[PDB]
């Protein structure tokens, strides 16, 4: 059913938020080790 759907939908704001505050510094990581 949708039980797993609704719960998984909680990840989208979380994943989007983590990136909004980590993407930039992450890009420094793979660029340094490139």
Residues within the interface to other proteins (CB under 8 A) = 1-2, 5
In order of 16, 17, 24, 27, the CA distances from 30 in angstroms are 20, 20, 11, 6
Separation of alpha carbons 20 and 13, rounded Å: 10
Residue 5: CB minimum distance to ligand LMG, A? 2
Residue 21's binding partner, choosing from ligand LMG, other proteins, none, with beta-carbon cut-off 5 to 8 A by kind?
A: none
Q: What is the DSSP letter of 2?
A: -
Between residues 9 and 15, which has the closer beta carbon with respect to ligand LMG?
9
Between residues 15 and 26, which has the closer beta carbon with respect to ligand LMG?
15
């Amino acid at each position: 059913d949708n039980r797993f759907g609704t719960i998984a939908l909680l990840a989208v704001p979380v994943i989007g938020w983590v990136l909004f505050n980590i993407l930039g510094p992450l890009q420094n990581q793979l660029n340094a080790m490139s």
